[PDB]
Design a protein around this motif. Structure first.
Motif, PDB file in Angstrom:
ATOM      1  N   UNK A  47       6.351  -1.561   9.823  1.00  0.00           N
ATOM      2  CA  UNK A  47       6.128  -0.725   8.638  1.00  0.00           C
ATOM      3  C   UNK A  47       6.251  -1.524   7.348  1.00  0.00           C
ATOM      4  N   UNK A  48       5.539  -2.643   7.297  1.00  0.00           N
ATOM      5  CA  UNK A  48       5.670  -3.586   6.196  1.00  0.00           C
ATOM      6  C   UNK A  48       4.301  -3.936   5.636  1.00  0.00           C
ATOM      7  N   UNK A  49       4.290  -4.634   4.512  1.00  0.00           N
ATOM      8  CA  UNK A  49       3.028  -4.969   3.889  1.00  0.00           C
ATOM      9  C   UNK A  49       2.357  -3.749   3.261  1.00  0.00           C
ATOM     10  N   UNK A  50       1.086  -3.942   2.907  1.00  0.00           N
ATOM     11  CA  UNK A  50       0.296  -2.882   2.289  1.00  0.00           C
ATOM     12  C   UNK A  50       0.215  -1.668   3.203  1.00  0.00           C
ATOM     13  N   UNK A  51       0.511  -0.503   2.645  1.00  0.00           N
ATOM     14  CA  UNK A  51       0.411   0.761   3.353  1.00  0.00           C
ATOM     15  C   UNK A  51      -0.739   1.575   2.775  1.00  0.00           C
ATOM     16  N   UNK A  52      -1.381   2.347   3.649  1.00  0.00           N
ATOM     17  CA  UNK A  52      -2.334   3.380   3.249  1.00  0.00           C
ATOM     18  C   UNK A  52      -1.958   4.665   3.964  1.00  0.00           C
ATOM     19  N   UNK A  53      -2.053   5.793   3.270  1.00  0.00           N
ATOM     20  CA  UNK A  53      -1.753   7.097   3.853  1.00  0.00           C
ATOM     21  C   UNK A  53      -2.979   7.984   3.723  1.00  0.00           C
ATOM     22  N   UNK A  54      -3.378   8.653   4.813  1.00  0.00           N
ATOM     23  CA  UNK A  54      -4.584   9.481   4.746  1.00  0.00           C
ATOM     24  C   UNK A  54      -4.451  10.697   5.657  1.00  0.00           C
ATOM     25  N   UNK A  55      -5.243  11.728   5.335  1.00  0.00           N
ATOM     26  CA  UNK A  55      -5.357  12.941   6.132  1.00  0.00           C
ATOM     27  C   UNK A  55      -6.755  13.086   6.710  1.00  0.00           C
TER      28      UNK A  55
END
Length: 174
Positions: free
Chosen positions: A100-108
């Motif tokens: 759970x590291x680095x660039x994160x993206x969250x989407x639905x």
């Protein structure tokens, strides 16, 4: 409830075997599978017993040849029904690096191309916050399929993958 029917030949011919619950091995009853009918729900079918090898997701419908589930061949021997939480929704966090590291993206939303939308071709960890999702090795929902059913995935082996290559993903909806 839900039910899946496997047939040894194309076009729903030959010997058949029926399931309505999980089945860790039906090789006893059918030595190959060339067509499938799915009723009432979504199923995961597996190349090898005990839910191993390549996996294919099949929503309700008729599949008269293995190509219609994007199968590689007629080798199938276990299956599990995909249970969707009642009245649930969908949300996923994808991460550039492990744990759970680095660039994160969250989407639905469904993502037919991770490169076009998020400018990545690999996912190294993931949290499924709500719902059930499928990861695909290639864009447009092709290649290796992996089932991500709601919570944490620290490394690609946690969704069954031997590499971080993921290029599309989508929700399993009712």
């Amino acid at each position: 409830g839900t039910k899946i029917t496997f047939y040894e030949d194309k076009d729903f011919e030959g010997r058949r075997y029926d399931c309505d619950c999980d089945c860790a091995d039906f090789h006893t009853y059918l030595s190959r599978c060339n067509s499938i009918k799915v009723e009432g729900g979504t199923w995961a079918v597996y190349e090898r017993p005990d839910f191993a090898g390549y996996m294919y997701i099949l929503p309700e419908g008729e599949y008269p040849e293995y190509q219609r589930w994007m199968g590689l061949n007629d080798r199938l021997s276990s299956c599990r029904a995909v249970h969707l939480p009642s009245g649930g929704e969908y949300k996923i966090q994808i991460f550039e690096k492990g744990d759970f590291s680095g660039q994160m993206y969250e989407t639905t939303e469904d993502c037919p191309s991770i490169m076009e939308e998020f400018h990545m071709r690999e996912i190294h960890s993931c949290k499924v916050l709500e719902g059930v999702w499928i990861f695909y090795e290639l864009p447009d929902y092709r290649g290796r399929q992996y089932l991500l059913d709601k919570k944490e995935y620290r490394k690609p082996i946690d969704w069954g993958a031997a590499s971080p290559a993921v290029q599309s993903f989508r929700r399993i909806v009712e």
